[PDB]
């Protein structure tokens, strides 16, 4: 829900004032979006051990985790190893018993996605769609009818 300015100081800047005391570091970049998404990249030296740089970073952000909104806490914070690019892209469709752009995306992320991401050292998976959820669309006219709020 958050806009670009909201994420920029309530999450982005909070973690950046807590991103120090980390062996080897060339620079740090950052993004903050109107969609409500932030993504930092701490780039290390050539041939730096990435199995340990993915800990000094991920146990340091965390001293600033309690200084964030509770909304971000119950959402997915993550510290993974990146490779700005894909390799295998496994599309998934239906032919005979036809199904939708939502029925397929849930089955992908409720049977195959969790097993894929833990398999032979995968960095990070990007699900093309969304896992199912108990979605509720509140009508504000039928809310005022019985004197009620969200």
């Amino acid at each position: 829900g958050a806009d670009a300015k909201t994420v920029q100081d309530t999450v982005t800047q909070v973690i950046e004032q807590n991103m120090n005391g980390i062996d080897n570091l060339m620079y740090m970049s950052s993004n903050s979006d109107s969609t409500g998404t932030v993504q930092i990249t701490l780039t290390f030296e050539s041939g730096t051990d990435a199995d340990i740089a993915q800990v000094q970073v991920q146990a340091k952000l965390q001293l600033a985790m309690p200084l964030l909104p509770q909304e971000v806490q119950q959402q997915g914070v993550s510290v993974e190893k990146s490779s700005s690019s894909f390799l295998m892209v496994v599309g998934v469709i239906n032919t005979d018993g036809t199904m939708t752009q939502e029925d397929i995306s849930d089955y992908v992320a409720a049977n195959m996605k969790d097993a894929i991401s833990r398999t032979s050292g995968v960095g990070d998976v990007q699900l093309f769609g969304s896992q199912y959820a108990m979605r509720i669309w509140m009508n504000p006219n039928e809310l005022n009818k019985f004197q009620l709020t969200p």
């Binding site: 690019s85 295998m88 496994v90 599309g91 998934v92 239906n94 397929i104 089955y107 032979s120 998976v125």
Partner: protein, 150 residues
Amino acid sequence: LKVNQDGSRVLLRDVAKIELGGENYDIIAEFNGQPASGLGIKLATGANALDTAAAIRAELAKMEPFFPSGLKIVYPYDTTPFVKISIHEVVKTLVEAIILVFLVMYLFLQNFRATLIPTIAVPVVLLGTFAVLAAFGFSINTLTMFGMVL
């Protein structure tokens, strides 16, 4: 939600629509104008590439048999077959760099037996060099394989 004065019950359905749908409607994919989801897997900053993607099909192979009707897998954007070409074209080139050998060795020395020693000399060296790259750290890269030809 409520029980109004006159015994009537306000339910959650009576104020809001309720459907089982995605937790994020921001992105939706089309495979050739056909409704589709998928897995854009990304590398792990040190991983073994084509071995990792070999075990992407390891998980995926045990998934196929328990699919609903119509659910079939499809393979766009894939890096695997490019390395299959770079071995099948290099080991081919290699072989043509012999053969073309043999010819020059017969052209200059009509003695057969002589055209034979050079055709054992070099296969043995190719092999021993594989053993030293394994011992020092490196792999059968696109680079190192071109250095078997130079």
